[PDB]
Amino acid sequence: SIEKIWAREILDSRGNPTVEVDLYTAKGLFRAAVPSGASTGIYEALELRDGDKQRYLGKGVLKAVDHINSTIAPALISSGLSVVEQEKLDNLMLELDGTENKSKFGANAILGVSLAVCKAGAAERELPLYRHIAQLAGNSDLILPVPAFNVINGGSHAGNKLAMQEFMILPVGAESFRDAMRLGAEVYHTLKGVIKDKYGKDATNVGDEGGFAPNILENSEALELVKEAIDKAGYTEKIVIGMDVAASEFYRDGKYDLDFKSPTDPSRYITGDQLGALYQDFVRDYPVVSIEDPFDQDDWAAWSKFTANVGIQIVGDDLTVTNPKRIERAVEEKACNCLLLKVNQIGSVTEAIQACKLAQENGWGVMVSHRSGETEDTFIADLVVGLCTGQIKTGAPCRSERLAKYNQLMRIEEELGDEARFAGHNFRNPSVLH
Amino acid sequence: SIEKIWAREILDSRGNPTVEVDLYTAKGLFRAAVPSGASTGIYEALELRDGDKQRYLGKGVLKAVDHINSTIAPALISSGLSVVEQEKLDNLMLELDGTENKSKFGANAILGVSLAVCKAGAAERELPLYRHIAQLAGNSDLILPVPAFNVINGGSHAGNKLAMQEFMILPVGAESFRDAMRLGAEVYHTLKGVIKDKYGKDATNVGDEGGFAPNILENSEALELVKEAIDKAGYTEKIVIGMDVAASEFYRDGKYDLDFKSPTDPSRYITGDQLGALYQDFVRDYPVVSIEDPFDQDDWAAWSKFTANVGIQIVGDDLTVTNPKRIERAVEEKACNCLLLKVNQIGSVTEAIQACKLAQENGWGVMVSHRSGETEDTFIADLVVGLCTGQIKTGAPCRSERLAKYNQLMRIEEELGDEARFAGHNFRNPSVL
Ligand SMILES: [Cl-]
Ligand SMILES: [Mg+2]
Ligand SMILES: [Mg+2]
Ligand SMILES: [Mg+2]
């Protein structure tokens, strides 16, 4: 039932071009936009960039836009398939591309259409997007996720020495999602004053995801600042800490560099075992309940060893790239126990849902995720609810490419009323709350 | 007519609560959100905050929301008025409020509904939002505005010694609005590198509007950095600079302090004349074609004198605070020649349009503006096009509460097709195009 499709180039939260797709049906216009990461794993589906240095510094996405309007569009229209057939329409583009990593049209082109298709499908069945997604996934009793706000940005997301990428707070003890937003925001505002008083005002500017980017090096200090903010806000024991190390960003010849943003100096490099011993101290001295990408995307041995020696959540991101093939290996080698779900790491809604179900069926938790480069699109809000993962990270409660998703989640909770439950302390496995 | 009105509390780009309204008609759902404003004041409309220091540091807006759901909503529904009747519906809310500055219900409450009504009205007319606004204002020759990107911040918006508040780049030489976005984005990224190499990576983070706030004191240094970025990007002949001094922030005992962020010392204070002399140098040495709030909101003498002695655009912000009465005085005293248009500062769509037309009818330019605390709402994009102001400032090309507007403007340009026209070098008076 697809009448027409038109893609365009828009700008993401960092000012870089990205793909946006408008899809028309008898129900009206449905548009979606595609995110873009900065710390991208080498195994992620291909993000097709034009490479025209004389334009957007080679970051244009006209090629991906043209593939959509000139090749993908006519094909989906010809199929005559209803937009409710997410799997059939997605597989169609997959075949049309014909490559494993979507290197012909680009994962950004395919995903742009896939997303618009899903929104049109929900309208076709007269249902909110989150409910439609739930049916596509095979879920009934939906639930609001615990939000993980990245309030201190480091790594390749900020201008500071801080090597680790994200320090997140999770309002596990909130009464509802709306309440979770309040605690998150309150801690964030308290944290601004905590940082300002110790490092000055020039340390309250933010990184790509809205978290403060203080001029610090020690990751322990970041944790200390967050913990102090939590306590000062009066939410100790109601808010826990999450981390995204994104170790692949500072992996240097088997070793790890916790100061890679400074002039290269191998003498400061540390081994995997040392890095792991550091994490143990963090989990011991701080309320750290989740650590994402603690080791390089290829350093499997380190993942298995660490995970087997911790009782917290270990999240695969660059390790798994929302890819079933990589997920299968991680589950067999018990490399981690949670999957970070990024629709643009694989390239289609169908594959993302499949990756999610695969993790869930193996006892893994699943945290839906934005990319460091986001747009005003809010698809992941409805996605996390429909997939009942119980957890999502989509930024600090700062910068609207972040708030747009959090605001949408509050609207979802409002619409569901007493039909949905907050994940709370069961963010790892909310299927028990039903 | 209106079937239902439901308001809720959402978070703005800084993490503070604000008002969002859902308006229902036979046509469907129409929602809009309100940007950050001011709770206190004497001229501008005031936003109503809860004041509960225990909740959101006292920045909640539950009261404003309550007024919409338990008061405004039922009143507008009963009237049976069509959403196409913007003026009548807005007037009804103004009378329901009673105050002169919308201090009872809150400017954020009234504007929220006003914005939703306008979006719903456009649907009833079966027209895009920018077109509906154009008809409400009496315009037909729509025009795409030149964007003014705030890439370097100072004053109260930064932790540096830099006194002046905003340093913007305007792609007046762009071929279209889409092209203007590319130029702005390319210069922004180029600027980031220039700052990283000169000040260090630790100075490449962004402020509330997405611009950079390097540790600098000299205002000429900020201009120098922007100029270098423009040149390095290769657009020296297509991009000019706009400034927002926000002089009210450093106005001291009838004088001005270009280092007010340092320990008080009136011996460094400068007079209006001296401050104007500095601007004179900025205009001669850099491609500055526009300066906002060069003097205090009450220092009328300095405004009129400066405007009469320069040829650049002079924009009233705190001076005019989007207020008809203030605008009238500024017009009669020739204090400035451009109105910064902040819808939430007046409180209603109807009143904002009237303030815009008042300015335009008096030979003034008009630059639509965002607020420090923005939302994912894109209303002002359609507004600047429908009003044909020729210029808008809604952030650096960074942080989506800014990009949402810019992307929407690109969609509008695309929608206009061949009829699309870019203000370009005539951003001050697109009336000629
Ligand atoms: Cl403002
Ligand atoms: Mg990454
Ligand atoms: Mg990650
Ligand atoms: Mg101003």
Q: Is B152 helix (H, G, I), strand (E, B) or coil?
A: strand
Closest chain B residue to A182, measured at CA? B56
Q: Any catalytic annotation for residue B9? A: no
Contact A10 B407 (CB under 8 A): yes
Q: To which H or E segment does residue B91 belong?
A: helix B86-97
Q: Are the C-beta atoms of A12 and B403 separated by less than 8 Å? A: yes
Q: Which of A186, A209, A249, A351 is catalytic?
A: A209
- Chain B nearest C-alpha distance from A52 (Å): 13
Q: Which ligand is closest in space to the CA of residue B35? A: 1
Q: Which of A119, A192, A261, A342 is catalytic?
A: A342
The CATH T-level fold of domain A127-434 is: TIM Barrel (3.20.20)
Q: What is the DSSP string of A119-188?
A: HHHHHHTT--HHHHHHHHHT--S-EEPEE-EEEEE-GGGSSSS--S-EEEEE-TT-SSHHHHHHHHHHHH
The total of other beta-carbon atoms located within 10 Å of residue A196's CB is 16
Q: Is A249 helix (H, G, I), strand (E, B) or coil?
A: helix
> Which residue, B279, B175, B163, B288, is CA-closest to B227?
B288
CB contact set of B168 (below 8 Å; sequence gap of 6+): B148, B149, B150, B151, B241, B242, B243, B244, B393
Q: Using alpha carbons only, how large is chain B's radius of gyration in Å?
A: 21
The total of other beta-carbon atoms located within 10 Å of residue A419's CB is 10
The residue type at A267: S
Name B315's bridge partners: B292, B338
Task: Report the distance separating Cα B351 and Cα B323, nearest Å.
Answer: 9
Burial class, A267, CB count within 10 angstroms (exposed 0-12 / middle 13-18 / buried 19+): exposed
| Torsion angles phi and psi, residue A167, rounded to 5 | -125, 110
Q: Are the C-beta atoms of A376 and A33 separated by less than 8 Å? A: yes
Strands B28-33 and A4-11, sheet pairing: unpaired
Binding residues of A for substrate: 157, 166, 292, 317, 369-372, 393
Task: Say how many Å lie between the CA of residue A163 and the centre of ligand 3.
Answer: 13
Contact A400 B159 (CB under 8 A): no
Contacts of A182 in chain B (CB under 8 A): 55-56
Tell me how far the alpha carbon of residue A178 is from its chain's centroid: 20
Q: Which ligand is closest in space to the CA of residue B248? A: 4
CATH class of B127-433: alpha beta
Contacts of A411 in chain B (CB under 8 A): 8
Contacts of A397 in chain B (CB under 8 A): 11, 15
Closest Cβ opposite residue B189 in set A15, A185, A202 = A15
Sorted by where each begins, the domain ranges of chain A are: 1-126, 127-434
Q: Any catalytic annotation for residue A209? A: yes
Binding residues of A: 39, 157, 166, 244, 292, 317, 369-372, 393
Task: Report the distance separating Cα B107 and Cα B36, nearest Å.
Answer: 11
Say how many CB pairs under 8 Å bridge A and B: 133
First to last CA, chain A: 35
Contact B400 A396 (CB under 8 A): no
Burial class, A432, CB count within 10 angstroms (exposed 0-12 / middle 13-18 / buried 19+): exposed
Q: To which H or E segment does residue A330 belong?
A: helix A324-332
Contact A403 B10 (CB under 8 A): yes
Look up the CATH number of domain B1-126: 3.30.390.10
